[PDB]
Amino acid sequence: LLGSLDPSMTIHCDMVITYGLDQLENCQTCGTDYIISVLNLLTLIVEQINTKLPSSFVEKLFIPSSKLLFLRYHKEKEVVAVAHAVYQAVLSLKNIPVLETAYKLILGEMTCALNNLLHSLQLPEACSEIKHEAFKNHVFNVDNAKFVVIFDLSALTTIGNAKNWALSPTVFALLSKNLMIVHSDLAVHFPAIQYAVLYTLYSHCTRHDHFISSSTVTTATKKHFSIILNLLGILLKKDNLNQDTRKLLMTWALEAAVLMRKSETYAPLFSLPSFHKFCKGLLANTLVEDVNICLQACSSLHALSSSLPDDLLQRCVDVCRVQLVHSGTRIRQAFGKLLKSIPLDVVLSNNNHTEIQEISLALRSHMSKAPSNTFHPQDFSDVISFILYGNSHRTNWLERLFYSCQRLDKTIPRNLLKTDAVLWQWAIWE
Amino acid sequence: KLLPPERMKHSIKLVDDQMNWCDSAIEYLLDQTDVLVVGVLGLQGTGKSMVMSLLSANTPEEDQRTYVFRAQSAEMKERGGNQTSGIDFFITQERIVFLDTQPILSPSILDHLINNYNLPHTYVEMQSLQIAAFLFTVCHVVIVVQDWFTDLSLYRFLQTAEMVKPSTEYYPHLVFLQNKARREDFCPRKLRQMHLMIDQLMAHSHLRYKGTLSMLQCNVFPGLPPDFLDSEVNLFLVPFMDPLFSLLPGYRGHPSFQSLVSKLRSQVMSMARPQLSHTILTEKNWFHYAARIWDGVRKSSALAEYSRLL
Amino acid sequence: PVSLRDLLMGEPPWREDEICVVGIFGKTALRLNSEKFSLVNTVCDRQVFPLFRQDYSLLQAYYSQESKVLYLLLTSICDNSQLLRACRALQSGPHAEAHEFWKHQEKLQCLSLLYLFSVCHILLLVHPTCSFDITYDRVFRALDGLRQKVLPLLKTAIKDCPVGKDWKLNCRPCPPRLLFLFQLNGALSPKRRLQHALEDQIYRIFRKSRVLTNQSINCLFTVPANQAFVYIVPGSQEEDPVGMLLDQLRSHCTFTLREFLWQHVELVLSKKGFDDSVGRNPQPSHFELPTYQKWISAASKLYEVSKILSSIKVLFLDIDTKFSENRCQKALPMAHSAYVHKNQLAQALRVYSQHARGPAFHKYAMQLHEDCYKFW
Numbered sequence A: 001l002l003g004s005l006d007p008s009m010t011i012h013c014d015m016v017i018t019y020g021l022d023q024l025e026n027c028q029t030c031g032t033d034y035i036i037s038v039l040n041l042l043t044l045i046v047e048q049i050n051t052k053l054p055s056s057f058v059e060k061l062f063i064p065s066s067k068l069l070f071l072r073y074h075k076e077k078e079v080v081a082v083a084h085a086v087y088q089a090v091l092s093l094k095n096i097p098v099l100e101t102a103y104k105l106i107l108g109e110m111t112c113a114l115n116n117l118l119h120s121l122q123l124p125e126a127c128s129e130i131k132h133e134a135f136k137n138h139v140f141n142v143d144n145a146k147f148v149v150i151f152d153l154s155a156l157t158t159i160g161n162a163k164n165w166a167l168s169p170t171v172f173a174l175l176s177k178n179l180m181i182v183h184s185d186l187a188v189h190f191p192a193i194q195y196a197v198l199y200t201l202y203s204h205c206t207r208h209d210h211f212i213s214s215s216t217v218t219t220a221t222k223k224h225f226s227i228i229l230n231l232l233g234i235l236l237k238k239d240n241l242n243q244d245t246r247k248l249l250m251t252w253a254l255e256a257a258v259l260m261r262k263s264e265t266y267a268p269l270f271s272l273p274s275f276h277k278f279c280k281g282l283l284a285n286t287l288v289e290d291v292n293i294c295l296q297a298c299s300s301l302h303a304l305s306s307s308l309p310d311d312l313l314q315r316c317v318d319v320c321r322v323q324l325v326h327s328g329t330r331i332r333q334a335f336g337k338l339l340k341s342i343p344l345d346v347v348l349s350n351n352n353h354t355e356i357q358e359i360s361l362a363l364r365s366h367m368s369k370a371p372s373n374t375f376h377p378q379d380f381s382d383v384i385s386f387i388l389y390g391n392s393h394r395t396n397w398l399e400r401l402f403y404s405c406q407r408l409d410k411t412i413p414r415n416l417l418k419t420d421a422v423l424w425q426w427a428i429w430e
Numbered sequence B: 001k002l003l004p005p006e007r008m009k010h011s012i013k014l015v016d017d018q019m020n021w022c023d024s025a026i027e028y029l030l031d032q033t034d035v036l037v038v039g040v041l042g043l044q045g046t047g048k049s050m051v052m053s054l055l056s057a058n059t060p061e062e063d064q065r066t067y068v069f070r071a072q073s074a075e076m077k078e079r080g081g082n083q084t085s086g087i088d089f090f091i092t093q094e095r096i097v098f099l100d101t102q103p104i105l106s107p108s109i110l111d112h113l114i115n116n117y118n119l120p121h122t123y124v125e126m127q128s129l130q131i132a133a134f135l136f137t138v139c140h141v142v143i144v145v146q147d148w149f150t151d152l153s154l155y156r157f158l159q160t161a162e163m164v165k166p167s168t169e170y171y172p173h174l175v176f177l178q179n180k181a182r183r184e185d186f187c188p189r190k191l192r193q194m195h196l197m198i199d200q201l202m203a204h205s206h207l208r209y210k211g212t213l214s215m216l217q218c219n220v221f222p223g224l225p226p227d228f229l230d231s232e233v234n235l236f237l238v239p240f241m242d243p244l245f246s247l248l249p250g251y252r253g254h255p256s257f258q259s260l261v262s263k264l265r266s267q268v269m270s271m272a273r274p275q276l277s278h279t280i281l282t283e284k285n286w287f288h289y290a291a292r293i294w295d296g297v298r299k300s301s302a303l304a305e306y307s308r309l310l
Numbered sequence C: 001p002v003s004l005r006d007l008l009m010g011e012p013p014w015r016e017d018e019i020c021v022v023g024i025f026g027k028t029a030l031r032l033n034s035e036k037f038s039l040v041n042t043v044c045d046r047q048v049f050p051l052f053r054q055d056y057s058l059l060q061a062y063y064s065q066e067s068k069v070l071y072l073l074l075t076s077i078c079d080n081s082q083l084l085r086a087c088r089a090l091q092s093g094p095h096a097e098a099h100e101f102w103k104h105q106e107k108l109q110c111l112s113l114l115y116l117f118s119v120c121h122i123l124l125l126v127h128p129t130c131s132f133d134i135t136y137d138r139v140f141r142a143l144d145g146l147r148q149k150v151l152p153l154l155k156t157a158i159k160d161c162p163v164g165k166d167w168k169l170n171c172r173p174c175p176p177r178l179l180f181l182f183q184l185n186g187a188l189s190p191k192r193r194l195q196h197a198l199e200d201q202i203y204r205i206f207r208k209s210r211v212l213t214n215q216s217i218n219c220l221f222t223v224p225a226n227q228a229f230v231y232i233v234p235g236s237q238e239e240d241p242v243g244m245l246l247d248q249l250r251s252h253c254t255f256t257l258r259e260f261l262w263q264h265v266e267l268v269l270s271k272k273g274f275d276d277s278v279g280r281n282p283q284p285s286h287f288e289l290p291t292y293q294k295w296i297s298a299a300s301k302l303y304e305v306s307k308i309l310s311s312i313k314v315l316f317l318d319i320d321t322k323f324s325e326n327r328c329q330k331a332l333p334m335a336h337s338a339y340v341h342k343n344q345l346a347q348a349l350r351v352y353s354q355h356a357r358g359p360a361f362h363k364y365a366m367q368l369h370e371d372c373y374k375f376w
């Protein structure tokens, strides 16, 4: 009956609001068929009464004692879907005064959950600039807080993925500086929170071309590209990153790298320090154990091979030289293509190759140690046969031999075990 | 002149289906010393054959039909039956022995014996103990494969199998492998609980279940500090086999299957190789030693005494 | 949802109501949400158990008025939830003390299981994998022996109860029906074939071990002869709420268990009962549908039950302990016939250690040392 008319009237709002709240306040231990109907009715009520809803409605709908916050803990996915739909409908209102109340309540709950998680690890509190009074003293379990944080982030994606909301803490600023604590220690124990935050930020940034055109609304987004590059470069230099997060970072970095070369009007953007940090992170992601990560980094460096300072090209030359000898054929071809894109004035200059120097240090460290006496006669026979006659009689056999010659009861970096030069030198020495 | 000995394309049976020794593996052994023997133990469908194949001479990119240790077929799981029977033997080009055994306390084996001294249940229970004791006395490392964490009944079986061994007592290393691990099992909070439960469930086992094969040092958990764990037991996790924004893959919360398998294979190849007996044995001598051990285990006294108690 | 002990002490709105008791037990993996709670939540269609909410055994109860079915849940050491607590307590606070501790826990679980089989109509067994565990064959055989021995005490406890005539003689409402529930765990219509194969395997194994006989009166439990009693739970996205939330977030940025249980509950709720016998000469089976107060009158008396402690101490870690004691006793004569005196004592101790060992080696070693020292 309510859906027949259009939101252009002045029907009794108190009657419907009271009717809906009465059923919502007594729908805890109810069947699945009744909760869905109650939530659908609430969504329809919020959508029908556009800009005419008092602050009391949204205020009572997002408090710790509200029944809506406890209805999202259902097991069936259908109940969670309608529960999220209610949040989406409330966050899709055009009335700024009432939208801020719900926004602050959601941020307060998020801060409370984050504080509980931080306290669980014996760490000080944080995010005191978005705290709310309604959650002054509330205790959330690890599983409960971890669940509400992700649920709230997903709910915020409603406004984060909008195509045009002037709130105090903007979505971009919130996810880029307010929730920066999730990358220090919360990432090691709860990587899902970091992944959700990064995914939401990436989804919101990709819809506006990563705010590259601005580098009323244009003047407000005149410094988001630099922040994005700085965040990517800072997070990529970390040597204790998660496998899932690193892949997302590589995809985002490659997309940004390709986008910076789409037009010539972005030429003056290659002189900002953020670009230097981004390039350093890209270089640091190479020579890792993951083949796909190395391929992504190589592709990103090749896309923007030119317009790069000589200081970075010189570093890329050493990386290419080291990757020329790899067990996998894809890495060799990709790095060879990248090396062929560097001018001869840099490839043949007399600067030192630091990656080549690490290899020497590893070989020296292994030679300086005492003999292990683990090289068996069969291994020697195979190695000598491959040199004197050309037949190894073994069907990546060098890595297997190296691993079989080690003993766990009784020092070369693991990322260097994929280089054929190191393996051959070690085998000859043995 | 310095040609290689030979190569194996498939595994061979070391023990017949009727618990009979098979003397057919001596044709692939040499007079070389410092050999490494690896064993496996697990339930009916934990995945012992697949793990042994991927650790000896197979890769995940291959097909299950080329595995050196035959795995279960799609039609076999429909009937609730086992695939591997007896004890299998296989040696790689690196001179490493791999042994694959039949499931312990298998319902399929018992059912098969039904359609054929007191009750078959006791016989099936004694066979598992005999195999476990033989592996414990002739292998350097024994891997235990489990589908779910903490059966609570496998630890008792492992401890009782050790108490009925044939005969400075030698104790091999033990590795706890959790197969088909999920995302919730790769969290530090649950990892600590798993380690604590393992340490408390085998406080008086005498087996070398701790000290080596630490997945924390294999970069599985990049930022986890070593002090987070009170005691690190030999535990490893194996999960289920498997513009630019729209192509992002789903979140799994754990490393790839191939990466973990490679890490486990790399660590198993570096296991210690202590002395089994008070004599330096070669590849050919170990065969005779194992044959004598099997013969003595079959006609033993401790096993008979334990059997008479049921 | 309250504890069984906290429910028998205390009803008027539903005192006279025909109810059917259903028990739940089995092993559960170390998961955030136990599989037993999910079963009750799905059968009742409501969130009965909310999410994020010396003796390591517990019995819970719950009554559903819409279905007139009483649910009883059992949690013990077999569940990783209690085992984690036990290990945590053992970590903070001897090879012989731990053995006794585990044995005591096993005995408590056995007693609870024995009590559950006397006050239930239908029992469900859950397992984290599709493979059938054969240890249950021995567990059931050990339970039947204890049940057939403490029968006089159990019957005398409820002697003065309005349960009925057959109930007072058999100390149970009727022969309970056992149901099995397995988890796919990524395995694999194929489900129907697997269910039939599992049913046949379980029936054959239990029949050979004499657990199931032709007469449904002597057996501890019965299984349907024409209906299905094995259910396989397929995988779903319900578990691991974090993963489901992540999937939903990603999408935003761009028969049944109830029927399987009702087919058996309807028979009890319709006074028909369970008739299962294939010995070519079936005998009548007792059956009685009680009320809330009538059932509580017997449940309270059975829960409070003096000689059970002594009768349960004859019944597993007992075999291991006996084997270890026998081995130690046999090895002691060799060491006692082997031996200033420090060298002889050390040699005897080494010989004894290399001869035999087990879970009771400290006692034998101390006795041998004392005997050797008292002879010099």
Ligand SMILES: Nc1ncnc2c1ncn2[C@@H]1O[C@H](COP(=O)(O)OP(=O)(O)OP(=O)(O)O)[C@@H](O)[C@H]1O
Binding pocket: B042, B043, B044, B045, B046, B047, B048, B049, B050, B051, B070, B071, B072, B073, B081, B082, B083, B084, B085, B102, B103, B179, B180, B238, B239, B240, B241
């Ligand atoms: N981690 C895994 N991911 C996917 N499939 C797996 C995994 N582990 C095992 N499987 C599958 O489950 C089955 C396991 O049976 P498999 O033959 O590997 O060994 P098994 O069950 O230990 O042996 P047996 O039945 O002889 O005792 C196979 O079909 C295998 O493909």
Ligand SMILES: [Mg+2]
Binding pocket: B048, B049, B070, B071, B083, B084, B101, B102
């Ligand atoms: Mg097998």
